[PDB]
Structures are given as structure tokens and as C-alpha cells.
Write a structure and sequence with these properties.
- 2 copies of one chain form a homodimer.
- With 200 residues, chain A is an alpha+beta fold.
- Helix content of chain A is 34%, strand content 17%.
- Chain A has a single domain (1-200), classed as HIT-like (HIT family, subunit A, 2-Layer Sandwich), CATH 3.30.428.10.
- Chain A has helices at 7-11, 54-60, 62-73, 77-87, 94-98, 131-138, 179-198; strands at 19-22, 26-30, 39-44, 101-106, 116-120, 142-144, 166-167, 174-176.
- The first copy, chain A, has a 6-stranded antiparallel β-sheet. A two-stranded antiparallel sheet of chain A has the order 7-8.
- Bound molecules: zinc ion (2 copies).
- Residues 168, 170-171, 173, 185, 189 of chain B line the site of one zinc ion (ZN).
- Chain A binds a DNA duplex (14 and 14 nucleotides) through helix 6.
- Chains A, B: Pfam families: HIT, zf-C2HE.
Amino acid sequence: SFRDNLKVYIESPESYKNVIYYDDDVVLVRDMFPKSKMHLLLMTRDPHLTHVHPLEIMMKHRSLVEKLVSYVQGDLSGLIFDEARNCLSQQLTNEALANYIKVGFHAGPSMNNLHLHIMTLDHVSPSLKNSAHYISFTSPFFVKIDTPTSNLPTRGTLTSLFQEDLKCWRCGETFGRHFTKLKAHLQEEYDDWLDKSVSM
Amino acid sequence: SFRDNLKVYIESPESYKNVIYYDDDVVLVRDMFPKSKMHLLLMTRDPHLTHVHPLEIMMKHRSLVEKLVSYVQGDLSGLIFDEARNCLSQQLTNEALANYIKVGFHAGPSMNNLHLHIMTLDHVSPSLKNSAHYISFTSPFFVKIDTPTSNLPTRGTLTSLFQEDLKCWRCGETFGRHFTKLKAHLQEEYDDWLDKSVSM
DNA sequence: TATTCCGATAGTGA
DNA sequence: GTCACTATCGGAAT
Ligand SMILES: [Zn+2]
Ligand SMILES: [Zn+2]
């Protein structure tokens, strides 16, 4: 099944150059279809935990949540900032980049192996091809890793999000269902953010 | 306006080789986007009648209706059969062709100059490109010229027809909204009809 | 809400 | 229900 496509990264990380980190516990791998300039996946290698739904992970597996956050903010932090500088600009400091990165799970992932998204905010990417892509990362469907448990969405409830009008995440401008127009505007927003960020 | 596109044929039929007949009263012209193998338009040149709605023509202009029918069955009859043989097959007799030709108005034409469609039944044509095309010629939206007045549709009432599932005019097979599949089937139906018709 | 391919659907401009 | 262009929307296979 296509839904098991990610299992090869946790089973044989030694085989993939796009696996930019692995140890006995986790794998950090580049998303094959990046939905922002930088888009990485952090995957547990635990044979049981990998098949636990991310909302259940957030609710009842706080040790794993803390462990993943610890990887992101510690041992993988330098690596992630270098990936971001290569994907965006060498001229961007850790401080600028940290405020331009989000980390979270999809509330309804299609792939069955638990994967934590670590990505830049731009959503400027050739692989961003439709409204559902965009909405999945910019609505409550994207469950940020620091969401309090009492604020988690209920499994299966967010279907209707995907039919809503499009709004730019940065400035709030609306685009109805005109995805192509949104796309062009996201480019502009990135150009703007970059100019402002390097200008210090 | 694009809606006045046909007026050139009644104003200056002398200028167009695809005007296959003209006199002081009418013009017979090839449809520029034929929706069957043969698709002709018979147009009154009368400055007033040309802008009368076809349903009003059918209801209250019986002399013009009779005159158009007289052209079709009389002085233009040989011409129409030749067009049909060239468009379909030389091997088809007048008798076979007469049962494979329909004559009628659209209940809601876009073009403003009154035009009577004279066309073969096949609907096999590169210009037949969507469901609305097909439905416009095979439903009550196509008002056959011999429709009794008491059985005419009311102006503006047939909008909903265009959303219905597709059915083959010849054998009744249904295709949902799969237009491409209908198209392929119409080809087959034409091949079948042709084989049967020349086989005397 | 995995991608990709095809095709139906919708709005516009002329 | 003029055409033609663009883009959105929808199902199916993988
Ligand atoms: Zn914006
Ligand atoms: Zn049929």
C-alpha cells in the first residue's frame, strides 16, 4: 500500500541519502514532496509507536513527544538550521529561522508511519500543488507539537476544513478557491520576508 | 457581440463559400462547429423575423415555419442529401438519409439570428466537445420543426436539462456524466448504423 | 488530508 | 445552452 511508503526510512535509513540523521530511536528524512522550501520528517523507529495515531501520541505518549522535541531543539538543531539556510538563504540567522519554522503532526495523515513535520513557513514549493496541501499545513489540521492536550482536535472531525476559502498565513489576504493566485502571492510574501530578515 | 456572429451570413451570403444556398428570403450555411457529421443552418434573411425567438416563431409565425419546411423538403432537398452523402457516405440512399436527419431550433439559442438546425443524428464530430453540446441536440431543448404548438416547451424553463446524466440517443445506454465515454460510444453507434444502412 | 493521470466542471473574456 | 483559455474539482489506480 502507498500508505506504508515511509516505512523504508525507519527500517533501512542506511539506504537513503535523504535520511539526514538516524539513530536507534528516530530518523530525520527529507520529505520527497516538500510543501515548503525546507520540509523534513522526524520519525520514531519504535515498531509499536510508529503505528499509533498522532493524536493518540499527543494525548497519551508524552514521553515520546518530549523526546522528539528534545531532538529538534538539541542534537538535531544545528542540522535543521543548516538545512534551512541551504533551502532558503545562508544569510539567515538561527534566530530568524527559529521564528520561521513550524513543527507538528497532521490530524489525519495518509501515511501510516508516525511522522513529525519540521518545515519553514513559506509554503513556496513546486510540490505545493493544490488547496488541500496548503490547508493541511496552515489550519488546525496541522497539530503543532506544543499544542496543549486539552486543545487537540478530535480524530476524524476536520474534513470540512478542506472546502474553506484560502487565506494567506502571513498577512490574512483571502483568495477564495483561487489556489494559483495564492501560490503567486506566497512567492511575494517569501521575497518580502527574506528582504526584511536579511536587512536585520 | 459574439451573439451576432451569424448575421454576416444573412447580410452578405455572397461573401462566404460555406453558404451553400441563398435567395432573397433565406440562407443555408454550414455550421462552423458541426455537432454531427453534417450540420447546416437555415436562416431567414427577414430583418424582423431573424430576431424573433424560435419558440415565438413556432407559436405565432406558422407561415415562416411552413416556408422553411418547404425549402428543406423541396428546393434544398437534393442539396441537403448531397451534403449528407459527402459528410457520411456516398453509399447512403435518400431514404436512409431522410431517417437520419433532424431539423429543429434550440429552445434557448445563444446566437441572436434565427437559425434552424439541419443535421445528421450521429453526433460524431470533433466539435462535439462537452455534455451541454450533446444534450442541447438530443433533449426537448431541441425543438423539432414538426412539434405541435401545444407541445412546445416554455421559454427559459429547460436550464436543468444540462445537469442530467448522459444517454445514447440511439440505444438508450447511460453514461452518467462521462462524456468521453459517450463520445467513443457514438462513434461505435455510427459505424454500426452505417454498416447496417449500406448493407441494404 | 500520499502522487499522478485523466477528465468533468466552472468562470472569463470576446 | 457560441468558442477557447485557464484553472479548479473529482474519481481511480498505485
Ligand atoms: Zn499575504
Ligand atoms: Zn447506443
